[PDB]
């Protein structure tokens, strides 16, 4: 589990969104595994606006933050899960790192801010849904 709280927005993995999230929807994209909802209180996270390929992510299955090198956001084939069939997921970045299904939502961050959240993984790999291209997350 995990969310990014920037301004009046809550960014969660679309497959983990609650009834309250759907009842206060701002934007969702199934192919990116992202959903954004509105919040009443202001968030303290800051979105990275950069082209970084190194950062640090939170792994709840180890209660540790790990330094990682990750690929550029792309269209990657992802195996079937309980939440999606086997399909291509867009805006996905891969890294070598420990992950388990419940690690979804952990933040990946660089020196510029929050880069994205854990979305995919398995066999010593961890994948992150990028949020750096979503410039609207900074205003209104």
How many other C-beta atoms lie within 10 A of the C-beta of residue 136?
11
Is 33 one of the annotated active-site residues of the chain?
yes
Between strands 125-130 and 87-96, the pairing is antiparallel
Among the listed ranges 22-30, 48-56, 68-76, 119-127, the one in contact with ligand A1BSD (CB under 6 A) is 119-127
Burial (CB < 10 A; 0-12, 13-18, 19+), residue 82, is exposed
How many other C-beta atoms lie within 10 A of the C-beta of residue 77?
9
Is 51 one of the annotated active-site residues of the chain?
no
Burial (CB < 10 A; 0-12, 13-18, 19+), residue 117, is buried
CB of 7 to ligand A1BSD, least distance (A): 25
Give the x-and-dash track for 38-67 against Zn ion (CB under 5 A): ----------x-x-x---------------
| Lookup: tokens for 9 | 């927005």
- 91 a known binding residue? no
Give the x-and-dash track for 35-54 against ligand A1BSD (CB under 6 A): --------------------
If you search the block for the tokens 């933040």, which residue do you land on? 107
Cα separation, 51 vs 29, in Å, equals: 22
> Residues 28, 29, 45, 100: which binds ligand A1BSD (CB under 6 A)?
100
Residue closer to Zn ion (CB basis): 17 or 114: 114
- 50 a known binding residue? yes
Binding site for ligand A1BSD (CB under 6 A): 15, 33, 78, 81, 83-84, 89, 99-101, 103-104, 118-122, 126
């Amino acid at each position: 589990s995990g969310a990014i709280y920037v301004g009046n927005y809550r960014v969660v993995n679309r497959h983990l969104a609650t009834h309250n999230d759907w009842a206060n929807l701002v934007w969702e994209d199934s192919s990116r595994d992202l959903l954004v909802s509105s919040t009443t209180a202001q968030g303290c996270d800051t979105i990275a606006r950069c082209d970084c390929q190194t950062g640090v992510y939170y792994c709840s299955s180890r209660r540790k933050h790990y330094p990682v090198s990750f690929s550029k956001p792309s269209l990657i084939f992802v195996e079937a899960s309980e939440y999606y069939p086997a399909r291509y997921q867009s805006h996905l970045m891969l890294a070598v790192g420990h992950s388990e299904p419940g690690d979804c939502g952990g933040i990946l961050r660089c020196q510029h801010g929050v880069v994205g959240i854990v979305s995919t993984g398995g066999n010593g790999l961890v994948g992150f849904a990028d949020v750096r291209d979503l410039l609207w997350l900074d205003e209104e």
